[model samples]
Target chain A: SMSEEQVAQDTEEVFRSYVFYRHQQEQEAEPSSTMGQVGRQLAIIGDDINRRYDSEFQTMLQHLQPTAENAYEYFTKIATSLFESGINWGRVVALLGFGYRLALHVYQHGLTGFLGQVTRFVVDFMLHHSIARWIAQRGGWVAALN
Target chain B: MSEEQVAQDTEEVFRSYVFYRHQQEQESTMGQVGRQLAIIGDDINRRYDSEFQTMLQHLQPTAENAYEYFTKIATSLFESGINWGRVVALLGFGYRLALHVYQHGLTGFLGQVTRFVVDFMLHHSIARWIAQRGGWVAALN
Candidate 1:
């Protein structure tokens, strides 16, 4: 069980390290496109976890609220956009799917789990860099179906 | 169009549906979800009317100034404390984007852009919701 301070420190460390790897990858001629997108999405999801829910987190520690503004604004963003985006939509679905998984890590496991996942992501990213560099050094192997 | 752009549009439309569905799930006094969406649609149309694109372009949210502040002054309330979730925030972004497109096709290059800012706030609400849930999970966990 990690303390909030430990969790925050771990998350921050992972996020910073991940950003460094990402900067290195962007310098490469070719980077993992899906992985890059996933990374970007992860960054956004991570921020959402900390900033938006801060107050809600405070409350089990209290309880309260009134509502939101321009009921119309609330309506469009929440209801209108979902309906408009449609079901078979790929990007929204994919992003949302990734977001959901990221959220689940937070939901099911807690900050510890979320930080653990981030740490795992950093390891995997480094593995990717190592393998690609290895392949490059080996003159890029070409495979033929047996 | 590009896959990313198309995907963005698709995401927004889907989000719109989600907002509608969630509202429906809440079982509000409001009519059907479709009707509620229509209410949204009707309001945007009513406000933007002829100046829609121009208003949105000239008045959309910016780093220094935002509609949230204007909303506060106009309503005489603290607009900053509104609740939003990610699902809904995405929806608001889409709604504004769609309204812009609507104005583009229906009116022209820059009609009025009325609802875009307000639409964005919808997402603020959703983001607020996700954050709330995240906090709960964090604390309980």
Candidate 2:
């Protein structure tokens, strides 16, 4: 519906707009404060853990497959494994950090996309009971609560 | 009762519990633990902030996406064998303080859900440091 010159000019404008939008998005992708640092750290640690335990992590991720039914099972299985593996406590905490960061990522899709009851339950359980109990035993606020 | 009313009632109960819990902490020895953690956190930040900042300068994070830059920072720390426990403890204290401030300004009920979420994450990692060394009781003694 337009001349060749007009179409070229319009295409260039669209490309420029896309590049500007991308630049804005990239800027927003990194938080500029302390909590932002922590979030970034969590993601890094998560990615490292995922790489180290590629098979298990991949399997666990597949279990999530973004389905409600799978979410619960995935969390339950992960929790049970953490306890049973008796892996280094630091390792467990790192994994939990990884999970929280992952959930935040999932949140971008919409809350329901990731914060399903099962997923919430697992994250909550790890944060509240499993991790909290560990800290409590260590003689801190959690310990004091007991 | 309507579902909305029931939901509201449930929230009220939970809020009451969080406030009650916060009250208990203020009165009991638990308050001491928070204070201790605060001091430890401050000490770590004092010790590490410069180093972290120096590292940041080298990375020039402003030039990169935040997530990518932070990932590099995190990995650098990890590779450096920085004390993971200390890092977790510092983060835990920050979360603790944020929740304390948040709970203070809002209706305990209004803040209950958020409090639980943050509280759990803080406790989870803080506990890791304690458990990694020995039981808290043992460490304190």
Candidate 3:
């Protein structure tokens, strides 16, 4: 339902947006307790999703080897499977939960710092196009949530 | 101790128990989910062992400084809450700490600090949360 060019464009747009968000968090994570508190609250929501789908996630994750190269396919497969049918609030939240799980895996690998560009790009692309097309047809993300 | 600090410390400790909690929760499916964490932990250790060791040389850790360093590290980690991934990373740091302590012969602080890290610093913090969630078995899950 998406052109290769469209996907590419969205991927770049997603990366830029995410970089901005990451930059803001970096700036605020130090001085602002509110940012940290909001993060903690959101993290628990993410954690709840992980625990709920822990069983299925473990199986699917067998494919997610801990290398930048392997992560690309892993996320592509995941993103496609997640929204291949359609989009819903539940599935949308599941994708966010996937973010928590994937981030944890990277943190465990100590690639949380230096070597995250590839996974980071793939994740952005995955999140952007996975539901964006459906939501665009339906209006936009806010409307999709509505 | 301040009520806030106590709660903060326990949240970090609860993260350390993620492995234990994961195992206990996955009683039937343990076989399938095992060893992946070991592999991930191995990667973490290799990188951070080098990274932290260099920092250790820079800082010249002592009983006082090491404890403070350890506290800061743990505090900064759980600032994001008890996300299971961050919890695993915290455990990785503990493993590194044990090796660092053993090699430098800082057993006095090592033994006591590990105790302080495990029990004294954050027990009450987790205790309240654990009871509400049910217990250790169901806590992290």
Candidate 4:
């Protein structure tokens, strides 16, 4: 019943409206998203660690250096810290022991896909940044100070 | 309950997991993570060159050890009503990143890599436990 021109115009309008709706929905639904959740948690954790020990997490991160360059020294630093800290020693041991367990997984199995890779990046970045901050705060990193 | 029942539940969940569209969603969510990693990689590479991944990767365990190393540190903060979400995120991110470097399956894989199996177990098991408990906070920390 409608003319071809009228039908075409209606289709375009409908499509455009749907797209606008989707864009709006995305914006409105956002806020407290997974990314926000994750990022906020990271910041919060950093703050808590900062508040508790005046930068011990920073020291741990720096002294450990989880990747290729500072492998032994990092491990040594972690072990030494764990041995010295005395409080909640088991928790520290378990976290590090299991952390070692996880490192082995991706290292041996080779994480696939984009998520795995991105996850890796975040973990490393936070690890290093937190460490640098800790060292600057701690001021007594035996390795650096010695 | 029964071992068989537990096995069945785990199987169903895992089957749904790997085959699920979650991978797509996860990848999409990783954009910020990607940018962060780019910065990490470049910085570490510039600093240590050959030891970039290993050096960066070591941070995971170190961070974990820090928790235990200074148990009172985060735990006290946590007890004081400081949010534990960030600690969990920090640990998870550290674990996931190490997993990424190893995912490449380099020839030297077996020669290195110490923390993968246990890491995933904690990661998955805790996530499942959290889901069951209806408290992401309790499950994660």
Maximum-lDDT candidate: 3
Best by DockQ: 4
Tens digits of per-residue lDDT for model 2, A1-146: 32333322332232223323333444687624332333333333334544465345555555555432243345445555554545453554444433433333233333233223322322233243333334434532333222
DockQ-based CAPRI category assigned to the predicted complex of candidate 2: incorrect
Clashing pairs in 2: A30-B66, A135-B127, A136-A142, A136-A143, A137-B136, A138-B136, A139-B136
DockQ head-to-head 1 vs 4, winner: 4
Q: Candidate 1 — number of clashing residue pairs?
A: 47
From the highest TM-score down, the ranking of the candidates is 3, 2, 4, 1
Model 3, residue B76: distance off in Å is 45
A19-75: candidate 4 lDDT, tens digit per residue: 234334435768344323422342233334333442444445444434443344554
| Candidate 3 structure quality by residue, lDDT tens digits, A1-146 | 33333322332222233323434554587642332333343334434544576456655664554432344456546756766676444453354344434443433444222223322222232233332233234332223111
lDDT computed for candidate 2: 0.36
Between the candidate structures 2 and 3, which one is better when assessed by lDDT? 3
How large is the i-RMS for each model, in angstroms? Answer: 25.3, 26.4, 29.6, 26.3
TM-score quality measure for candidate 4: 0.21
What are the runs in model 1 whose C-alpha is more than 4 Å off? A1-146, B1-27, B31-34, B37-53, B67-69, B72-141
DockQ of each: 0.01, 0.03, 0.01, 0.04
Model 3, position A145, has a per-residue lDDT of 18
Worst 10 residues of 1 chain A by lDDT: A60-69
- Tell me the lDDT of candidate 3: 0.39
Question: lDDT tens string, model 1, B37-93?
Answer: 433433443443233335557654331243342233323221233222221222233
lDDT of 1 at B25: 40
- Worst ten in a row by lDDT for model 4 chain A: A137-146
